[PDB]
Structure formats: structure tokens, C-alpha cells
Paper text:
The collectin family of mammalian innate immune system proteins recognizes pathogens by the repeating pattern of carbohydrates on their surfaces and organizes their disposal through neutralization, agglutination, and opsonization while recruiting immune system cells for their destruction. Bovine serum [name] has been shown to bind, through the globular carbohydrate recognition domain (CRD), to specific carbohydrate structures on complement effector protein iC3b, which arises following activation and cleavage of complement component C3 (12). We present here high-resolution crystal structures with and without bound ligand of a recombinant fragment of the C-terminal carbohydrate recognition domain of [name], the first crystal structures of a bovine collectin. The [name] CRD monomer has an overall topology similar to that of the known collectin structures.
Author numbering: 230 to 317, 324 to 351
Amino acid sequence: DGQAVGEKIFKTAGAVKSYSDAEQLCREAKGQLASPRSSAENEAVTQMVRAQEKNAYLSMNDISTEGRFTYPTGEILVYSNWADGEPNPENCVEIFPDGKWNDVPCSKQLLVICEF
Ligand SMILES: [Ca+2]
């Protein structure tokens, strides 16, 4: 089970992993890391973070061009929800239980939320 918005479904098993391990878990499940593209999608992911009491990874990263955060397609963000002062190396993105985002080191261990 999980939270859905439109045709997108977000799911978690409560796993806590580094970015690379998180990406592999979602891909092996035939999904990808949570990639909220709208307010409504962001709120669905946020509800799951609040339930699990653990910040989660989003998919987006700036490893290709610093400051330019992209999806696994390589396309630029169509939506963002950065915390005050963010983005403030921190190439990956976490989402807080208040729904705001913070760039983080990709070695950080965070909740794994996948989208389908
Ligand atoms: Ca940061």
C-alpha cells in the first residue's frame, strides 16, 4: 500500500539507506525514488515522512551540473520546495516532515520512499 496523487503512487517499507542503496531498492522494485512534481505530490510524500518520523530522499541530484537539480531523466526541476536558506558537498535532497527540502551529502542514511 501507499499514498497516491493522480496516477502516481508513493510506497515505503521503512528502509533507511544511503542515496545509491535507496536508488537500487526502488529500481529493483520497478519504480524510482520519490520525485514530487507538484504541491499535491509533495504533500503525499510529506505525510509518509511524518508517519515514519524520518526524513526521506528525493530522486533529484545536482551531480551533473552543481546547483542544477535534475530527475533521473536528466530534466530540470518543474517544482521545488526548499527550506528557508536552502540549497545553502551536498549533491542529494532530503524532505522534512514539514515538507520542505534540504540538500544533503549522498552518503546520508534516509527513509526510502519509491514512486510507481
Ligand atoms: Ca543543505
